[PDB]
Write a protein that binds this DNA or RNA. Structure first.
Lengths: 134, 143
DNA sequence: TAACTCAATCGCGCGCGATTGAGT
DNA sequence: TAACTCAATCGCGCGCGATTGAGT
């Protein structure tokens, strides 16, 4: 009984924490007209450019069911180019635009100006991953 | 110093993102039998601790509003977990009350989830604290 | 042909910023 | 008349289980 009481408060906290993070980031990012999830995509691209959609998804644990509509939005607001690979026409190469690369510093400053754990999350992250399989 | 503190906030934000998605995935798997969602579960938890409540009250417990809870309490009524009825004293209000089935099925739902929790559960109390800390930190950061 | 691997698509339920309109 | 306080509604962007159809 008490092991359920723990899982619930812990689940519920994670639920509250992620919403709050999103709320916060979205407030700061409103200037740029990008969402929290779009920001997470742009982080991976700022760390490695270009990437395939599938590669981005692997970094974020997301798939085309989320990234397809959403990379289309980032293209439509000038952050990225979506183009097909010649080696493999099934693939989709995502490449940052100049504007997309350029605005990183501005975006990071917009958020930074308003600012054990990291381990504890990664622990639970890996615990849950296993629970979804075996 | 200028930048490395951002790299911390990002990995921490991204971890919380991943953790909550996984928690939802897990609970949704176990709750499929009962035909309820994670969020619906969270609403049922507050009702199992206090019944009846007004939609506004539930929302206060979960930091949600009618923009989420209206469509969703309608779903729980349709699957026989709750009654949605307006108050006489104040016709604006909406009283949510658990159905017998709704009350009754708590034990079964808890068991369905608890049976799949690893024995890894009197050395996770640290975690529960660390979350609540960040939860409160973030809540102040928004205001 | 076939098996495979991709992004794209579909349907649905949230979250939530914003607005509406009923009721006090 | 007004100031309030509610749930309901609207529009949009996710997440994601599932399917599709193009390409290898």
């Amino acid at each position: 009984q008490e092991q359920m009481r723990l899982a619930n408060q812990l689940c519920f906290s994670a639920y509250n924490v992620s919403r709050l993070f999103a709320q916060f980031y979205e407030k700061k990012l409103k200037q740029f007209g990008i969402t929290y999830s779009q920001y997470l995509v742009l982080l991976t691209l700022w760390e490695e450019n270009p990437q395939t959609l599938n590669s981005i998804g692997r970094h974020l644990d997301l798939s085309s069911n989320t990234l397809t509509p959403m990379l289309k939005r980032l293209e439509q607001s000038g952050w990225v180019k979506r183009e097909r690979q010649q080696s493999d026409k099934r693939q989709l190469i995502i490449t940052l635009t100049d504007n997309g690369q350029q605005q990183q510093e501005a975006v990071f400053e917009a958020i930074s100006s308003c600012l054990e754990t990291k381990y504890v999350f990664e622990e639970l992250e890996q615990t849950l991953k296993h629970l979804i399989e075996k």
